């Protein structure tokens, strides 16, 4: 059998870019911060709870789905590009709307730990794993009005936890499903457009 649950993180953060000119591509840092995660998706055909007497195998993969473009409050498109993805695996590059970053750090791990192996949407749990930062750079449209900006960039981040009854178990949430996942994170990009 196979139980997969996606634990969605949803913290709000701000990044100050300062004074910028439309000929620049100001960057902003996206950090992965430990916190409370909410189940927003699952697929299970196995047991609901492990009482401690039995073994199962773990496969954990971190996910980040980031938009390639975001509308400013006043109605202007900002183009988001990956500047430094660190060790993250950038996949489904063909998509025209979102970036897909993954990082599998655990697989084939046998465990007897008692617990719920298929929590339902809405359930929570604490995540303490840390992952590399991802730095992006933004292209501002030349016609962007001067002034201060505080752009809300919503995105998805979380832990795909896969529990299975056999060694060698492998699973990846489909990209088309992932892109639809709730984007509970929010990066508030701050900057003052002084022309250019």
Backbone angles phi, psi at 73, to 5 degrees: -55, -40
The domain locations on the chain are 1-196
Please give the backbone phi and psi of residue 178, each rounded to the nearest 5 degrees, phi first.
-55, -50
Short-list 104, 109, 153, CA closest to 129: 104
- Buried/exposed code over 44-78 (b: 16+ C-beta within 10 A; e: otherwise): beebeebeeeeebbbbbbbbbbbbeebebeeebeb
Q: What angle do CA 59, 62, 65 make, to 5 degrees?
A: 140
Residues making up the binding site: 59, 104-107
Strand partners, 103: 62
Instruction: Give the residue among 186, 183, 153 at the shortest CA–CA distance from 40.
Output: 183
Q: What Å distances lie between residue 48 and 60, 114, 119, 183, CA to CA?
A: 18, 11, 8, 26
Q: How far apart are CA 191 and CA 193, in angstroms?
A: 6
**How many whole angstroms separate alpha carbon 139 and alpha carbon 159?**
30
**Gap between the Cα atoms of 90 and 68, Å rounded:** 13
Q: Which parts are annotated binding residues for D-galactose?
A: 59, 104-107
The angstrom resolution of this structure is 2.1
The CATH number of the structural domain formed by 1-196 is 2.60.40.1370
């Amino acid at each position: 059998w196979n139980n997969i649950v996606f634990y969605s993180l949803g913290d709000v953060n701000s990044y100050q870019g300062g004074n910028v000119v439309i000929t620049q591509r100001p960057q902003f840092i996206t950090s992965w911060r430990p916190g409370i995660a909410t189940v927003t998706w699952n697929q299970c055909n196995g047991p609901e709870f492990a009482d401690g007497f039995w073994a199962y195998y773990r496969e954990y993969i971190a996910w980040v789905v980031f938009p390639k473009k975001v509308m400013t409050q006043n109605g202007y498109p900002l183009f988001i590009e990956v500047h430094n993805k660190g060790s993250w695996s950038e996949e489904n590059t063909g998509d025209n709307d979102s970036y897909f970053f993954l990082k599998g750090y655990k697989w084939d791990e046998r465990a007897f730990d008692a617990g719920n192996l298929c929590q339902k949407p809405g359930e929570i749990t604490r995540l303490t794993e840390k992952f590399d930062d991802i730095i992006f750079k933004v292209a501002l449209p030349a016609d962007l009005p001067l002034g201060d900006y505080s752009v809300k960039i919503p995105y998805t981040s979380g832990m795909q936890r896969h529990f299975a009854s056999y060694l060698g178990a492998r699973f990846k949430i489909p990209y088309n499903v992932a892109k639809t996942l709730p984007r509970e994170n929010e990066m508030l990009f701050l900057f003052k457009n002084i022309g250019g």
